[PDB]
Design a protein around this ligand. Structure first.
Ligand SMILES: CC(=O)NS(=O)(=O)OC[C@H]1O[C@@H](n2cnc3c(N)ncnc32)[C@H](O)[C@@H]1O
Length: 668
């Protein structure tokens, strides 16, 4: 008699609620959680962070968490309507000072970064001392190129530890870094370099990932042929293979830094000075450069890292994402270093050299938290439990999932094998535009449901709106689109040189609120469930189906590895469901009739969800197009089903781009 249902799971609901396990109870010598031990302890604190009396908590947290050069007077001002959001406006600080210097002063030899190289043997620890020195050298290099406060600097770097040095060097001097995924095409890089109008670019000669070479300098040379503003390129010698270097314009990182001293003063930045531009990916049109301020962004990432992952001073936090993704900005670099702990820079893939890489990593470094995307989790689940069963992994207390809904089936695999049923699983919902985690369980306090984001984070006041009426749906057991009622410190302040695009996209669809673009439901118990992108909804004869529920139903079938469902025009039902399925490699599609597997999947969807949810067609494919932003390229599959595959655009964001040519063949 519940209008909203959990994402489909094999475990009955009665047996599917997971209270904080002993490692998250302060037992067995593990640290005490910062918030606990139950749901009410979370509400008691959160209620201090929203509403008309929350200034006090926020003022105290900002003064406790960050080192300031000048105190602020006003806590907050502004709003969504014109996009004039302000937090701590009169304060001054520097992000590099808070992520490096202050920690270097207390414990210089403490490990700031665990650099997990593409080849495991080349891995090493980078202390705060070394990281600060390299950051200062690069900052000195940038100042000699004439970079001033407020100038954009493009960064095209792979996942080597110096990427952190380059982010922080820009922040140290007040420049605005703009990081682009290594491996993006020359065209994509060009569009971002030209939009941010930078005069300096930082890159490598080459990157190494999964044993394959990323030809970064060659791609940069092709892009710069159409980037007339770029005058200096700083090239890090990562592999040492011969690459072209333009005399005058191109200089070697090691040769330039050797000329510079190893300390550099910090630019004193206003709270609202821009910290960075981060261009989103996966759209056809103009790239969208999301801008973040300094003090609110930093405080938000520091508080989320502390509270969502229950970080403590000696923790070794392992976020395995790429720094070209907001997840890397916030939970590799800014969040963890702000808190003064050890953070991971993972250069490889989850299956190089074998699908045991993640767990070999955890046991070698004694990682205490692990944070990756559902795409990685489904991949590891796909390769079998042999690569996980005989690892220790007991250093871990918290496992995190970010970037897409995590199917209960994958949630359980994570819970059973990575955590051995002794970690808390935090499903973190947020966006590039929100700066930091928006909805997630606090692991010492919240009992989890597989596939639920649970409850909003401090400072976040979220609601559900009927998109048909535009009115808020009060109470529980409601479904609609997710909106936030009030600004929060780490919200993006604008889209670079395109504020109108910022207002029209996020602020005007539901005037007075911030519009995430996701469908959501709040269940009988008040847990939030992120259903998927509003754009991915399929309307079958008046029934609106979300992607997370159908993909979750499909993966409950034995042998299914990963799925993706997209809609297309249908005369009978308005829109029809088309499902793309990949199976485990041990599956014998010769012994099983493919017509029979498609029929068994259609029944499984009809049982779990409804009579209307069955797919009209099902395509069996070896893999799906995925990005390093934790997402499946559904728009691409939708266009291919629509016959518009001839003009799909740039697939540079997809991990293995050759897969789209296979999907085209099988759909035709
Ligand atoms: C962090 C990130 O991904 N920033 S992002 O800008 O790259 O994407 C944001 C979009 O990603 C989807 N998304 C991200 N996390 C989850 C999650 N935990 N559960 C369900 N959906 C999720 C959602 O659609 C967002 O709107």
């Amino acid at each position: 008699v519940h209008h909203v249902h959990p994402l489909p799971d094999s475990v009955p609901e009665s047996e599917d609620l997971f209270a904080p396990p002993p490692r998250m109870q302060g037992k067995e010598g593990r640290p005490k959680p910062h918030i606990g031990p139950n749901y009410e302890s979370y509400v008691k604190e959160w209620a201090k962070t929203v509403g008309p009396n929350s200034d006090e908590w926020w003022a105290a947290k900002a003064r406790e968490t960050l080192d300031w050069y000048d105190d602020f007077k006003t806590v907050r001002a502004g709003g969504f309507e014109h996009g004039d959001v302000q937090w701590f406006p009169e304060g001054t600080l520097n992000a590099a000072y808070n992520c490096l210097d202050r920690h270097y002063y207390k414990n210089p030899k403490k490990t700031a970064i665990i650099y997990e190289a593409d080849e495991p043997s080349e891995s090493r620890e980078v202390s705060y001392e070394e990281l600060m020195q390299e950051t200062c050298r690069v900052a000195n290099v940038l100042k000699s190129y004439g970079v001033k406060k407020g100038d954009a600097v493009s960064i095209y770097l792979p996942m080597t530890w110096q990427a952190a040095a380059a982010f922080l060097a820009c922040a140290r001097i007040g420049a605005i870094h703009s990081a682009v995924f290594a491996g993006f095409s020359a065209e994509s890089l060009r569009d971002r370099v030209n939009d941010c109008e930078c005069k300096v670019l930082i890159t490598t000669d080459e990157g190494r990932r999964g044993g394959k070479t990323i030809a970064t300098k060659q791609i940069v040379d092709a892009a710069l042929q159409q980037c007339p503003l770029v005058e200096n390129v700083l090239v890090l010698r990562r592999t040492g293979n011969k690459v072209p270097m333009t005399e005058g314009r191109d200089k070697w990182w090691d040769e330039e830094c050797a000329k510079m001293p190893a300390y550099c003063p910090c630019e004193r930045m206003a709270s609202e000075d821009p910290l960075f531009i981060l261009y989103t990916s996966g759209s056809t049109g103009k790239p969208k450069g999301v801008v973040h301020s300094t003090a609110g962004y930093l405080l938000g990432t520091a508080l989320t890292l502390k509270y969502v992952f229950d970080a403590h001073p000696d923790d070794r936090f392992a976020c395995m994402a790429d720094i070209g993704w907001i997840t890397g900005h916030s939970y590799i670099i800014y969040g963890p270093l702000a808190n003064g702990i050890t953070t991971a820079v993972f250069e490889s893939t989850p299956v190089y050299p074998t699908p045991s890489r993640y767990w070999d990593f955890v046991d070698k470094w004694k990682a205490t938290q692990l944070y990756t995307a559902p795409t990685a989790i489904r991949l590891l689940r796909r390769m079998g439990e042999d690569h996980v069963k005989n690892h220790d992994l007991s250093s871990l207390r918290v496992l995190g999932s970010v970037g897409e809904p995590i199917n209960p089936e994958a949630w359980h695999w994570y819970n059973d094998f990575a955590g051995k049923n002794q970690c808390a699983i935090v499903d973190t919902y947020w966006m590039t535009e929100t700066g930091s985690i928006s909805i997630a369980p606090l692991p010492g306090a919240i009992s989890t449901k597989p596939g639920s984001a649970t409850f909003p984070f401090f400072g976040m006041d979220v609601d559900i709106i009927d998109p048909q009426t535009g009115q808020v749906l009060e109470g529980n057991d409601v479904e609609g689109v997710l909106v936030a009622r009030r600004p929060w410190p780490s919200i993006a302040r604008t889209v670079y040189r395109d504020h109108k695009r910022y207002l029209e996209t996020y602020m005007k669809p539901y005037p007075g609120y911030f519009f995430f673009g996701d469908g959501a439901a709040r269940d009988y118990d008040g847990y939030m469930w992120i259903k998927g992108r509003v754009d991915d909804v399929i309307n079958v004869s008046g029934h609106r189906l979300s992607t997370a529920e159908v993909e979750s139903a499909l993966i409950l079938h034995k042998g299914v590895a990963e799925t993706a469902v997209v809609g297309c025009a249908d005369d009978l039902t308005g829109q029809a469901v088309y499902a793309f399925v990949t199976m485990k490699p041990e599956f014998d599609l010769k012994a099983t009739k493919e017509a029979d597997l498609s029929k068994e999947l259609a029944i499984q969807v009809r049982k779990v969800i409804g009579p209307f949810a069955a797919p009209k067609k099902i395509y069996l494919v070896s893999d799906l197009p995925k990005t390093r932003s934790g997402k499946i390229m559904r728009r691409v599959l939708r266009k291919i089903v629509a016959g518009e595959g001839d003009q799909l655009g740039d697939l540079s964001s997809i991990a293995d781009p050759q897969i789209v040519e296979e999907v085209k063949q099988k759909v035709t």
